[PDB]
Amino acid sequence: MPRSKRSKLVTLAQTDKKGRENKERIFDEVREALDTYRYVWVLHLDDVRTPVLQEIRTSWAGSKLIMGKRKVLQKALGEKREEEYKENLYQLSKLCSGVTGLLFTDEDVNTVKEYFKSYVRSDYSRPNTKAPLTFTIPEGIVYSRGGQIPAEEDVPMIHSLEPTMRNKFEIPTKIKAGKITIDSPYLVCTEGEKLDVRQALILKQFGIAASEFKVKVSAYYDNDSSTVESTNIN
Amino acid sequence: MKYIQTEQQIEVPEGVTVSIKSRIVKVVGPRGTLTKNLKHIDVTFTKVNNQLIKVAVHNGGRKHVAALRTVKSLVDNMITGVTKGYKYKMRYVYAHFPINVNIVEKDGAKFIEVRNFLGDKKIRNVPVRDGVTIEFSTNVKDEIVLSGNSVEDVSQNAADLQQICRVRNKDIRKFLDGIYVSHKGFIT
Amino acid sequence: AHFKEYQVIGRRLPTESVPEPKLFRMRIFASNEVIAKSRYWYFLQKLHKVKKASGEIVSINQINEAHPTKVKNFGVWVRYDSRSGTHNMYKEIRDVSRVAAVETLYQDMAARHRARFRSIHILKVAEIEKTADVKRQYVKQFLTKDLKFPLPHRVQKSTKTFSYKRPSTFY
Amino acid sequence: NFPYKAKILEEI
RNA sequence: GCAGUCAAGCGUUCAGCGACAUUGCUUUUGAUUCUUCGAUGUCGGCUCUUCCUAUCAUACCGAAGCAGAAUUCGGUAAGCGUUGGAUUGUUCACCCACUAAUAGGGAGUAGCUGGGUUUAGACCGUCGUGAGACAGGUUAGUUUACCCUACUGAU
RNA sequence: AAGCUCGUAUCAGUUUUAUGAGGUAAAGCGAAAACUUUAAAUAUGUAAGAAGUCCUUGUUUGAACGUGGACAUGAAUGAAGAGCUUUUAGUGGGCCAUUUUUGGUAAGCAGAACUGGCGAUGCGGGAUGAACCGAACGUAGAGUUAAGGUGCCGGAAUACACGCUCAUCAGACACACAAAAGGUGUUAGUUCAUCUAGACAGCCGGACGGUGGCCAUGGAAGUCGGAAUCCGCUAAGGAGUGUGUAACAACUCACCGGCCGAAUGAACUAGCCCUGAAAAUGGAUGGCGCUCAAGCGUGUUACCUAUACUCUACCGUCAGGGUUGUGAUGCCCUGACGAGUAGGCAGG
RNA sequence: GAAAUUGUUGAAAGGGAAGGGCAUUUGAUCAGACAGGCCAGCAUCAGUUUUGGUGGCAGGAUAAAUCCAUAGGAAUGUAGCUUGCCUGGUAAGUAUUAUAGCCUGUGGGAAUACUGCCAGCUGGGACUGAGGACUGCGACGUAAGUCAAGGAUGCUGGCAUAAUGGUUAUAUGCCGCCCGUCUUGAAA
């Protein structure tokens, strides 16, 4: 483009792109862990809160959890039998589709699967999923928590986010002196409805963490036996 | 570099048909019909499978490619308006003097009448463009909804309606009275 | 005028005890033999301390295109010393012969960069052996299977000053 | 961008 | 303006040149300004036509702590307006009265002009032994047309 | 002008060779970058024989002075002027231009040498001209051209081929002052990066925990202010890029992650255009006007034409010859030229 | 008995000058000649000169190309085969010539492209006709003689006058600043 081209929004940030060096490091780490641990697991965690991820990681200090770009993990595990790092390892790599996810541990398979079945934590609405239950804003002053708890304990919404409510969340809000008020009760979600992006954002703003989450593991690989098993516990 | 030929794909839904002349484009569908004279653009049209139309420019420059892209965008907008339609919601806000809005009729022009804006005695009449219908909202206090098939007509009508209530010579940081487009969406 | 490729060789005069000079060879694009020899002498003087008066032309032979009826893609080294200092320039031209490619290159240089013939030096003209090696888009574009395009806005040259037909262009 | 730039190195 | 720092850059072959910024310069408590020092040459005004925006005001707008009123800057804008006066022991300016405003400039005008070039007059000082002029100063002292074109009217 | 003291065998605003010019160097090994061995025109004088050379054989080893004898020819190119003596109209410190150096500054430029034109000069072209290009001024015919042009005025192609420019007072404008740069205006190039270990840009998630890090504090939780700006887990989290709350909260960015998919991003160079400071009566690429130009660079052809050049008719001037026969000052043949102020000569 | 100047008769032009030069139509006017005066066409000649047709040759890589044969190579992959779809073909793998062809090198013979040469031929266009009994250089002819060879002759037609031609004003293509002195350069 000789001219009339896009201009990059330059900012004086401190962090910089890691580049291919990080990918190479993760590739080497994956190939080392493939032999350093007796068992390999593929964890399909599409999205998780960072504290939850750290809690999962520290749940067993005697294990290593490897994540990052899916393609890098697939290449480390091998894309074809002709170059797979371990026998039948191509099959395990083929099974990864979500935001993986690669756990290396010597712990008993039954213990790990039982822990993953029992482990559960709260999560946001995560749009593109059926809503947990219906929610309606009070037909009056709107509070920070949306009146889920008694209004005496709640606090009025800050005026700063009112433009966000109007333009982004698309709710006919009007500004009062000290409070934000709506003339009619506004329903944000209904039972079984597919959650839209705006509805999910509204729920997150109201802090409705009614949705539960549990990691998804599609299969595990036994290094000693060198055979793939398709355990599909939810 | 004067590319030999660049083309773009226009998707025509099964519910509508688009007959095109040398450069005159006509769209027909359930909600209504629209027309546009693109004789000044100098582009070509061609059917492929009765559901997709390819617009191509041979030996066209960068500006010609941009014109092709905007023609495709206009055709897509017309198709969407014919199929789904466009719905514009406008809200008028007042602090002390209530704003009175009514759709008066004289000689069939159907001007939108705004009175008592900021206490002004002048009566502001905004003519209603062709193909756009204006109806006062219900259950949403102080709101007027403009709907139509053509994006340009509805958008221009809304722009004129909001501009007619311009706050002149007063500090905009304090006088919030006016009319604004609250939300843009489809009729369906 | 129309360019021509001449094989020019120099054998800068053999002084006492130094017979059989090195017989330097060159390929010079020029409209005639005189211009080819002048350019050869200028290049020889530029490269080293030799001079026209100290040497002579061994033989001048025109290099005809091996296949003047074959369409080929050419990569040309272009170095011109105007307006600013000399800098490298690479251009790709699709033409049936090397001479036609050089003529088109010179015409394009004059059209765009205003560089004159005396201000342009051609270092290498190489035919691209295989497709997909061409890098510039304006040349790779024509290298497509079943390439077809129209010629809209056809204009007919009228010998008469007046026309009763209101000529139409078709299409 | 010269496709045969390697040939120059080979000749060198 | 001069004297220094830095280099985005150029570059005896990349030591020298060098953009934008930057330090010293010419009583910190709105206090005073009672300096106001040689233009060797005029400027200033009566009537009256046009033109430029580098716009004082009117017209339409944006940005300003624009709550109002009111005020500042900026964008377009020459269509229409930009005034009545004191001061010569000077008047290369100035003050106060209104008005929305009293913005800056060209064509200048032997049409009239007051200061200035001023000629034989005359009076005080300097020079010079003198005729006389000067660092001064004061004072009394052609002019169109009926010829041509230009413009306003008329056969 | 009268001289002929020449029929000049000598001359020259030129070339070649010998010697040099400041040594500009374009090496370089030599004594290992320490030498000049050697290698070239930017800018020039002298010398190129017949009044030249050789012999001899007295004098002053050296060197320089003398008589006598011998040979009538010394590079290219062009040509029939050696200059002085008898003297004689007009004029003498005049304007512009390239070059070499020399002394200077806001910027011009100043002092010198050489080299051309104008004056005294017509003719074609650049619209218009003392210096710009072309160009050898008798009266004529035919033809070919210079410079300048080929849309009209205006004689000649709205010719052919490649590109470049949309300008809300481009362009046809001098090559130089305003001129350093700036355009998310355009066309072509140079140098670096990321890339199916999923390139740029688009949508959603993470953006943690020590931690609300230390000083002040009414309030200071990353984002009013001052020093730090330490460490754990990652694919990643910066004692925080920005918006906002008194205070957090919340939003968002650096990065990373998920969806599509493939070229993308950063700094420069060159070509054209807009800015890069413009007022006074109304007008200027010469005017019309022109936009794949009738604008720009360049190539290929065709044509217009000057008093320029080729062939021929005539007058005159000059020069070489023939001419003993109503005028040898007469007649005939051949060859080259014809500008011009002051001024001189001759014929009318 | 002139002009400057003015009046009458006769002819011509006039849209903010007039006058002049090269060039032609027009009014008016005007000198010319003798078994020769004025204007043209045709034929074949000499010089200058412009534009076409066409033939034979010397050079290139003894042109290269094109084309035939030959050994290999490839895809912007020809036929066939395979995988998915299915409205007879379709998207990608295979397959180096098959139910197309291309490229590289070699072997083989022509022509054309470009330059130049011809003391080769030939058509058309324009200006010039100068000299004036022979003397000379030349060509074809066994010779006699002729000839395109040191400058054009022959034939034909009209008018034998204002027709050509001269003078003049206007008619129009272009050009054209007022002379003299001075300065001799904003030259004004």
Coordinates of N, CA and C (backbone and C1' of nucleotides) in Angstrom, one line a residue, chain F residues 9 79 104 140 147 167 224 228 249 255 279 299:
Chain F
rA9 P 61.5 32.4 -50.7 O5' 60.7 31.2 -50.1 C5' 60.2 30.1 -50.9 C4' 60.2 28.8 -50.1 C3' 61.5 27.9 -50.3 O3' 61.8 27.2 -49.1 C1' 59.6 26.7 -51.0
rA79 P 45.1 23.8 -50.9 O5' 45.8 25.3 -50.8 C5' 44.9 26.4 -50.6 C4' 45.8 27.6 -50.2 C3' 46.8 28.1 -51.2 O3' 46.3 28.7 -52.4 C1' 47.8 28.1 -49.1
rG104 P 39.5 36.2 2.2 O5' 38.3 37.3 2.3 C5' 37.0 36.9 2.8 C4' 35.9 37.9 2.3 C3' 34.5 37.6 2.6 O3' 34.2 38.0 3.9 C1' 34.6 38.1 0.3
rA140 P 13.7 39.1 -56.6 O5' 13.8 38.1 -57.8 C5' 13.3 36.7 -57.6 C4' 13.4 36.0 -58.9 C3' 13.0 34.5 -58.9 O3' 11.6 34.3 -58.8 C1' 15.0 34.8 -60.1
rA147 P 17.7 20.8 -35.8 O5' 17.1 21.9 -34.8 C5' 17.9 22.7 -34.0 C4' 17.3 24.0 -33.8 C3' 15.8 24.0 -33.2 O3' 15.8 23.8 -31.8 C1' 16.0 25.6 -35.0
rA167 P -8.5 15.5 -6.8 O5' -7.9 16.9 -6.8 C5' -8.5 18.0 -7.6 C4' -7.5 19.1 -7.9 C3' -7.8 20.0 -9.0 O3' -8.7 21.0 -8.7 C1' -5.6 19.2 -9.2
rC224 P -4.9 7.8 40.4 O5' -4.3 9.3 40.6 C5' -4.7 10.4 39.7 C4' -4.2 11.7 40.3 C3' -2.7 11.9 40.4 O3' -2.2 12.3 39.2 C1' -3.7 12.5 42.4
rA228 P 14.8 4.8 42.0 O5' 14.6 3.2 42.1 C5' 13.3 2.7 42.1 C4' 13.1 1.7 43.2 C3' 12.9 0.2 42.8 O3' 14.1 -0.5 42.5 C1' 11.3 0.8 44.4
rA249 P -10.7 -2.7 41.9 O5' -12.3 -3.0 41.7 C5' -13.0 -3.7 42.6 C4' -14.5 -3.5 42.4 C3' -15.0 -3.8 41.0 O3' -15.2 -5.2 40.8 C1' -15.9 -1.7 41.7
rC255 P 0.6 -7.0 21.6 O5' 0.7 -8.2 22.6 C5' 2.0 -8.8 22.8 C4' 1.9 -9.9 23.8 C3' 1.1 -11.1 23.4 O3' 1.8 -12.0 22.5 C1' 0.4 -10.6 25.5
rA279 P -1.3 37.6 -5.0 O5' -1.1 38.7 -3.9 C5' -1.2 40.1 -4.2 C4' -2.6 40.7 -3.9 C3' -2.8 42.2 -4.3 O3' -3.1 42.3 -5.6 C1' -3.6 41.8 -2.1
rG299 P 14.3 9.3 -27.4 O5' 13.7 8.0 -28.2 C5' 14.2 6.7 -28.0 C4' 13.3 5.7 -28.6 C3' 13.0 5.9 -30.1 O3' 14.1 5.5 -30.9 C1' 11.0 5.3 -28.9

